[PDB]
Amino acid sequence: LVPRGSHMNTTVSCELHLRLVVSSESSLPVPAGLRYDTADPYAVHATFHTGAEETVEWVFARDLLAEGLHRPTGTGDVRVWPSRSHGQGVVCIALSSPEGEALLEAPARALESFLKRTDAAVPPGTEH
Amino acid sequence: GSHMNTTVSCELHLRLVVSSESSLPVPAGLRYDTADPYAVHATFHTGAEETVEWVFARDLLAEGLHRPTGTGDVRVWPSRSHGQGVVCIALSSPEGEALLEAPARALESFLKRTDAAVPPGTEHRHFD
Amino acid sequence: LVPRGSHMNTTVSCELHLRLVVSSESSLPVPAGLRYDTADPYAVHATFHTGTVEWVFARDLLAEGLHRPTGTGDVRVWPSRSHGQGVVCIALSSPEGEALLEAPARALESFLKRTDAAVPPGTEHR
Amino acid sequence: GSHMNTTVSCELHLRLVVSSESSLPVPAGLRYDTADPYAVHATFHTGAEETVEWVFARDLLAEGLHRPTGTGDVRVWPSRSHGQGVVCIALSSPEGEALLEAPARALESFLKRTDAAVPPGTEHRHFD
């Protein structure tokens, strides 16, 4: 007989509503889920409910999202930058594929709250 | 509107103490959820698809590592077996009593992860 | 509608035969599987067929176990030889007891070279 | 002895080019396995749960990023759409031809991971 070992897992999960920027005038509701798992401590998994059947899933560098609160960061597929809308701070996320480009606004307080919880689980600079 | 949630999940193997000589394997899952920051949800696999679900005061389990204590249906105390620390957990149903040994390293590891998520004394901050 | 992203993953899988050391005289066959996934870049998932038991190893613990004795708490790993080939000895501890496994060194070292190709040690950020 | 295997798997979204104007979303999976180090196995989701499976010489896909080339059933060439690089893949079967656009960034990322696993010119070492 071989003794059994142990499995720990820490998951930080956030449910948000993002606004898809259609125009200066108009925007659409995009329910979003951010998932952080200490298993994969460099990544944040975002699932967007866009009206597509099977949903859209993106993986973000946690560090990219973290500095997106303070200054504009990101090239290729993802750009992130800070701004304000309807009298509250937001993070703007610009997603690019061959299909096209789409712009999302997230509540800043909520995004930075989620990242504080992942920092508690696994502080930046502590991936071992 | 925001749903933030940190979940610490642990898979352990406990021994059900049937005699001084002999014990049985009990696969267990411990789940800590910041939604309910005072509790640990344990699922015990005692039989072929026969499951028990128990809710523990996290603080009761935490003290059970270093001294003997208890409240209501649960008594917890430290001991050693095959040269490793364990926690003995005595559960009382109305009909009768069952005694479990948990690996102390594993249990203490799980509780360190929940302490990271919600340090004891800061459980009130997750009251929605 | 939001543009779609990309999700790529590298998995290194190894099938090994370990000997469970019963005595100086006797040992038992333990089929084993090591899985490395870039999803979880610090770990090696070993499934041992006792007819299964699953353990998670610090890849770095296994890597250093090829050249010197390392590990405390649940797992100790160290180099040795058996039936005229190099091995890694793995000592697994629970409250149940302790069990000792011998793995082929060449095979273990080969598996780790493939995970180092996928994710060089210290390059888990990337 | 041993059965050792490295698998690189990529989840991609391709556009089936039906007209100059219009295209359709085709979820795809690319799988590279060191068992078969010269090939890429692509699964295209065209239906509610109906699939097409194609095998590519990875070297054909790799060259298709930078210049137009082709062998047998497959022609591959570079282009751009909504300001991002793509690879056009023309699959010619007895039925007819389907034309696909793949994201170049994503395809080139996938091929870098297979080059890490098995650098081109070292494919003979994985012939068991």
Q: Which of A97, A101, A103 to mutate to test the interface with D (most CBs of D within 10 A)?
A: A97
Nearest to A8 among B10, B34, B103 (CB): B10
Is there a contact between A9 and B6 if contact means CB atoms under 8 Å apart? Answer: no
Residue keyed to tokens 């190099």: C86
The CATH H-level superfamily of A11-121 is Sporulation-specific cell division protein SsgB (2.30.31.20)
**How do the domains of chain A map onto residue ranges?**
11-121
Does residue B111 contact residue B62 with C-beta atoms inside 8 Å?
yes
Q: D7-119, what's its fold?
A: Transcriptional Co-activator pc4; Chain A (2.30.31)
Architecture of domain C11-118: Roll (2.30)
CB interface of A with D, residues 87-116, below 8 Å: 96-101
Does residue A124 contact residue A38 with C-beta atoms inside 8 Å?
no
Determine the angle formed by the axes of helices C105-118 and D104-117, rounding to 10 degrees. Answer: 160
∠ CA D102-D103-D109 to the nearest 5 degrees?
Answer: 115
Partnered with residue C48 across adjacent β-strands are C32, C53
Picking from C103, C81, C82, the residue whose alpha carbon sits closest to that of residue C91 is: C103
Question: Going by DSSP bridges, is the β-strand pair C85-93/C98-104 parallel, antiparallel, or unpaired?
Answer: antiparallel
Picking from D12, D82, C3, D84, the residue whose alpha carbon sits closest to that of residue A48 is: C3
C122 near A CB under 8 A: no
Does residue D105 contact residue C105 with C-beta atoms inside 8 Å?
no
B14 near C CB under 8 A: no
Architecture of domain B7-120: Roll (2.30)
* Alpha carbon distances (Å) from C88 to A24, C20, C40, C41, C98: 65, 12, 23, 22, 16
Residue C87: both structure tokens together: 């091995």
Nearest to C16 among D2, D9, D103 (CB): D2
Q: Tell me the technique behind this structure.
A: X-ray
Q: Which residues contact A56 (CB under 8 A, 6 or more apart)?
A: A47, A48, A50, C2, C3, C4, C5
Residue keyed to tokens 């798997």: D9
